[PDB]
Design an enzyme around this catalytic site. Structure first.
Site, short mmCIF file in Angstrom:
data_model
loop_
_atom_site.label_atom_id
_atom_site.label_comp_id
_atom_site.label_asym_id
_atom_site.label_seq_id
_atom_site.Cartn_x
_atom_site.Cartn_y
_atom_site.Cartn_z
N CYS A 117 -43.29 -65.92 52.82
CA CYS A 117 -41.92 -66.25 52.48
C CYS A 117 -41.83 -67.39 51.47
CB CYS A 117 -41.18 -66.61 53.76
SG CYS A 117 -39.63 -67.52 53.59
N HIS A 118 -40.72 -67.43 50.73
CA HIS A 118 -40.47 -68.46 49.74
C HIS A 118 -40.76 -69.85 50.31
CE1 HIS A 118 -38.24 -70.84 46.71
NE2 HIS A 118 -37.82 -71.52 47.76
N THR A 119 -40.39 -70.05 51.57
CA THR A 119 -40.60 -71.34 52.22
C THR A 119 -42.08 -71.73 52.25
OG1 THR A 119 -38.66 -70.96 53.61
CG2 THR A 119 -40.19 -72.70 54.30
N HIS A 148 -45.08 -68.33 58.71
CA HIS A 148 -44.11 -68.36 59.80
C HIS A 148 -43.46 -67.01 60.07
CE1 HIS A 148 -42.03 -69.09 56.06
NE2 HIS A 148 -40.86 -68.82 56.63
N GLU A 149 -43.98 -65.97 59.43
CA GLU A 149 -43.48 -64.61 59.63
C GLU A 149 -44.65 -63.79 60.16
OE1 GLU A 149 -39.87 -64.01 56.33
OE2 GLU A 149 -41.72 -62.85 56.16
N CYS A 199 -35.88 -73.80 74.20
CA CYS A 199 -36.30 -74.36 75.48
C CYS A 199 -35.33 -73.93 76.57
CB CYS A 199 -36.37 -75.89 75.40
SG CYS A 199 -34.77 -76.74 75.58
N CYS A 209 -31.98 -77.98 76.54
CA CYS A 209 -31.35 -79.06 75.77
C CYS A 209 -29.88 -78.78 75.49
CB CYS A 209 -32.10 -79.28 74.45
SG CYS A 209 -31.85 -78.00 73.20
N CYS A 219 -29.47 -75.66 73.15
CA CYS A 219 -29.70 -74.36 73.76
C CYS A 219 -28.57 -74.00 74.72
CB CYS A 219 -31.03 -74.34 74.51
SG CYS A 219 -32.46 -74.21 73.43
N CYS A 271 -32.47 -75.52 68.78
CA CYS A 271 -33.17 -76.23 69.85
C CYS A 271 -33.88 -77.44 69.24
CB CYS A 271 -34.19 -75.30 70.51
SG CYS A 271 -35.22 -76.09 71.75
N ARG A 275 -38.72 -80.51 67.85
CA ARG A 275 -38.50 -80.67 66.41
C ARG A 275 -39.33 -81.75 65.73
NH1 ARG A 275 -34.95 -83.72 64.70
NH2 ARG A 275 -35.26 -84.02 62.44
N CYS A 282 -38.36 -64.18 60.23
CA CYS A 282 -37.57 -65.04 59.36
C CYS A 282 -36.50 -64.37 58.51
CB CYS A 282 -38.48 -65.85 58.43
SG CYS A 282 -37.55 -67.04 57.42
N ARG A 320 -40.96 -58.19 50.37
CA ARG A 320 -41.86 -58.74 51.38
C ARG A 320 -43.23 -58.06 51.35
NH1 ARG A 320 -38.67 -62.29 52.06
NH2 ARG A 320 -38.52 -63.71 53.86
N1 APR Z 1 -28.84 -67.95 39.43
C1 APR Z 1 -29.02 -66.83 40.17
N2 APR Z 1 -27.97 -65.95 40.37
C2 APR Z 1 -28.14 -64.78 41.11
N3 APR Z 1 -29.36 -64.44 41.67
C3 APR Z 1 -30.37 -65.35 41.44
C4 APR Z 1 -30.23 -66.50 40.73
N4 APR Z 1 -31.40 -67.22 40.73
C5 APR Z 1 -32.26 -66.43 41.50
N5 APR Z 1 -31.64 -65.27 41.95
C6 APR Z 1 -32.19 -64.21 42.76
O1 APR Z 1 -32.31 -64.72 44.07
C7 APR Z 1 -33.28 -63.89 44.71
C8 APR Z 1 -34.09 -64.75 45.67
O2 APR Z 1 -34.82 -63.84 46.55
P1 APR Z 1 -36.29 -64.23 47.01
O3 APR Z 1 -36.91 -65.16 46.04
O4 APR Z 1 -37.13 -63.02 47.15
O5 APR Z 1 -36.18 -65.06 48.38
P2 APR Z 1 -35.71 -64.60 49.84
O6 APR Z 1 -36.87 -64.32 50.73
O7 APR Z 1 -34.79 -63.45 49.77
O8 APR Z 1 -34.93 -65.90 50.38
C9 APR Z 1 -34.11 -66.65 49.43
C10 APR Z 1 -33.62 -68.02 49.89
O9 APR Z 1 -33.08 -67.89 51.20
C11 APR Z 1 -33.80 -68.75 52.05
O10 APR Z 1 -33.68 -68.20 53.38
C12 APR Z 1 -35.21 -68.67 51.47
O11 APR Z 1 -36.01 -69.73 52.01
C13 APR Z 1 -34.79 -69.02 50.03
O12 APR Z 1 -34.27 -70.36 50.01
C14 APR Z 1 -34.20 -63.23 43.65
O13 APR Z 1 -33.89 -61.84 43.56
C15 APR Z 1 -33.66 -63.96 42.41
O14 APR Z 1 -33.75 -63.10 41.26
ZN ZN Z 2 -33.60 -76.36 73.47
ZN ZN Z 3 -38.85 -68.37 55.97
#
Ligand code: APR
Ligand code: ZN
Ligand code: ZN
Ligand code: APR
Ligand code: K
Ligand code: K
Ligand code: ZN
Ligand code: ZN
Lengths: 373, 373
Positions: free
Chosen positions: A44-46, A66-67, A96, A99, A102, A110, A114, A173, A368
């Site tokens: 994931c992006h994170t 985390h996935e 938990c 808390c 929860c 929760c 943390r 996630c 993904r």
């Molecule tokens: N300015 C913009 N305007 C519109 N779409 C945009 C722009 N900038 C980026 N995007 C699009 O946003 C999308 C982001 O998707 P992903 O990078 O694949 O990420 P994703 O897993 O979907 O999660 C995105 C966000 O949500 C949070 O939960 C995650 O941590 C991240 O912060 C991509 O398709 C990207 O092209």
């Molecule tokens: Zn809790």
């Molecule tokens: Zn994530």
């Protein structure tokens, strides 16, 4: 008894470098801990954001991820609800169940563990990972980039024994977050007009949720037109690229919907787009939900007039799902065909080529990627 | 037939100058208009804002005033629900009951006559006021600073004939806005912990609503400690002055409530306090409602983390009350002792002394001054 496990894991020794496939040691579960054999994990992006070193509280060396989905290998002292063999999904948002969070129906945040989790440690203040004589930190309380991980016993969801782990790991996630943003946070009503900014896995999951909720119009927004086809398959009634208009995106949407959308979801993590999503909402009752995570220090802004005249600004974390009790239900909804998961998998790789999953993300060519342990 | 009426009115000839009691002419009501004899009126911050010249929309000459109560003097063609003698309250937020906003249960922002009202004109595009050969503009569709005013028939609430007009004129804005912010916008539950920023008439009305809703704790916040006594009379459980602390007010509140308040209300119109009000809310479920009107151009800001972790930002206009049906109900709640009104009146003046109401407002010595026409 539970012995130390020697296995493979993708270690991030430092930021800005590709993950290193290493032989590591995983200590047995201490009291109220669970050791899990990871069968599949996605990226994931994170994970990438922490790996880049741009994350303030990101520390190394660490095992990211985390996935994931797997099977309980062993349980620590005092654990009775889980046993070796149980099919599970590690949770970065625990439950938990005791808390004040929860116990409150309005949140899923929760706070029991943390602090230690944020430091990459188990509840007792230590790590279960070691490699080449060095202590390796945990990540988001899950560390799924390892053949075996140890997590707090409150960070585990027991799921359907028949669930395909190479698919449901995604409920760890992205899918859950987007789907929940629609059904839990926004709680949109049938007929609602929606706008979804960002069409990656999170945005697609929001669309999926809007459709389940009976939304009438679902407008997908992304600067990458390659994302439109899949967004429509998920339910978007139409998609637009901000780059195709000279006017600000909120003005375009307001024009298209004669006033603005009933619900907007920002699934990018861009504070400028977050503002646009709010202003794209209809006067009087529009609601905007922030789902994407913005970079540290950046702030969102708008003129209070926007709120005084009826709009609401909200946000969500893991889709507002109380984790331990919801993830199993989400798995069941997938099993019963209520929600989709398979359609989110665009790529598959072996553990050794896990770094390719990161390349695919930077390329913008994936939703993904599932990594087989 | 209905003739032109020659009477007195407090005319604002130009921005930055005091009001002038002038002899004016009030034209008879045209189709779907109602001429009202104003019996009592109060002065609101909004009136001063426009008078100052800082309001980008402010136009002169104009007859200000939007907090009034009177008696129907006559009605125009097509008016049947109202007749000479009816006891009423002029409404700056009308209710045509047919537009998309009136039909939607989630808002009270009727848009039927917004365009002309913003230009200081009746729905037909002209003004009913003249003075010394010059056209005098209407204000907020009410212009209560006149012995006689003419309003759109959808800008009128018919109320209990026994209501004291020198008191209920306050339901024309302040009291209704604050009371509604609590019971309509926040919809706080019994036992809720609340914080109210700004203890003027609006904040006191919010406190009043929080008490009616059964809040367990109501913390009043104001830099003027002279406002605390009355706040406690209205129900505040404790009052704090931001000036008595060295830490930001949101930190003070969080520490006072073990995490933050369930609901906060900004009743000042200060964007910095608006941010503090939001951040003073409890993680996971806190809700902040913007009630004060900030100066044009200014904007609110915060880190999206505040929303992602559970807080919600809202706003309200005239307390969310669908005006025509709600105001009569509010008057009835006052008559039955459910809500207070008399307690908001701190000063009384004659029409010729109207400018003193503005002086009292800027001196910070009043809540509401009722002007006897
Ligand atoms: N300015 C913009 N305007 C519109 N779409 C945009 C722009 N900038 C980026 N995007 C699009 O946003 C999308 C982001 O998707 P992903 O990078 O694949 O990420 P994703 O897993 O979907 O999660 C995105 C966000 O949500 C949070 O939960 C995650 O941590 C991240 O912060 C991509 O398709 C990207 O092209
Ligand atoms: Zn809790
Ligand atoms: Zn994530
Ligand atoms: N930084 C501050 N922190 C706390 N209180 C403050 C602060 N700055 C001003 N106040 C207090 O805010 C209060 C404002 O009350 P009033 O001036 O009497 O105004 P009120 O009629 O109550 O309406 C307030 C606001 O609501 C709006 O919708 C109305 O137009 C105005 O913007 C005063 O008691 C003032 O001392
Ligand atoms: K809803
Ligand atoms: K509520
Ligand atoms: Zn209307
Ligand atoms: Zn007002």
């Amino acid at each position: 008894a539970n012995e130390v496990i020697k296995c493979k894991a993708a270690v991030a020794w430092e930021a800005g470098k590709p993950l290193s496939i290493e032989e590591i040691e995983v200590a047995p579960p201490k009291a109220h801990e669970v050791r899990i054999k990871i069968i599949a994990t996605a990226v994931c992006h994170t994970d990438a954001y922490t790996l880049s070193g741009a994350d303030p509280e990101g520390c190394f060396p660490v095992i990211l991820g985390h996935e994931g989905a797997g099977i309980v290998e062993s349980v620590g002292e005092g654990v009775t609800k889980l046993k070796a063999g149980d099919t599970v999904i590690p949770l970065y948002i625990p439950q938990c169940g005791e808390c004040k969070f929860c116990l409150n129906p309005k949140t899923n945040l929760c706070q029991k563990i943390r602090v230690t989790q944020g430091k990459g440690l188990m509840p007792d203040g230590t790590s279960r990972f070691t490699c080449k004589g060095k202590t390796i930190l945990h990540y988001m309380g899950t560390s799924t980039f390892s053949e075996y991980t140890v997590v707090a016993d409150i960070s585990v969801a027991k799921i359907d024994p028949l669930a395909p782990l190479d698919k449901v790991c995604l409920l760890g996630c992205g899918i859950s977050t987007g789907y929940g943003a629609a059904v839990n946070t926004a709680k949109l009503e049938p007929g609602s007009v929606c706008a979804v900014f960002g069409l990656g896995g999170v945005g697609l999951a929001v669309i999926m949720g809007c459709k389940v909720a009976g939304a009438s119009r679902i407008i997908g927004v992304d600067i990458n037109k390659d994302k439109f086809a899949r967004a429509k398959e998920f339910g978007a009634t139409e998609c637009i690229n901000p780059q195709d208009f000279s006017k600000p995106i909120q003005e375009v949407l307001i024009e298209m919907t004669d006033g603005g959308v009933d619900y907007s979801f920002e699934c990018i993590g861009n504070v400028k787009v977050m503002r646009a999503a709010l202003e794209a909402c209809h006067k009087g009752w529009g609601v905007s939900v922030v789902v994407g995570v913005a970079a540290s220090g950046e702030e969102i802004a708008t003129r209070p007039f926007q709120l005084v005249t009826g709009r609401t600004w909200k946000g969500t974390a893991f889709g507002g799902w109380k984790s331990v009790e919801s993830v199993p239900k989400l798995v069941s909804e997938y099993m019963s065909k209520k929600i989709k998961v398979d359609e989110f998998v665009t790529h598959n790789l072996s553990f050794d080529e896990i770094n390719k999953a990161f390349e695919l993300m930077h390329s913008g060519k994936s939703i993904r990627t599932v990594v087989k342990i």
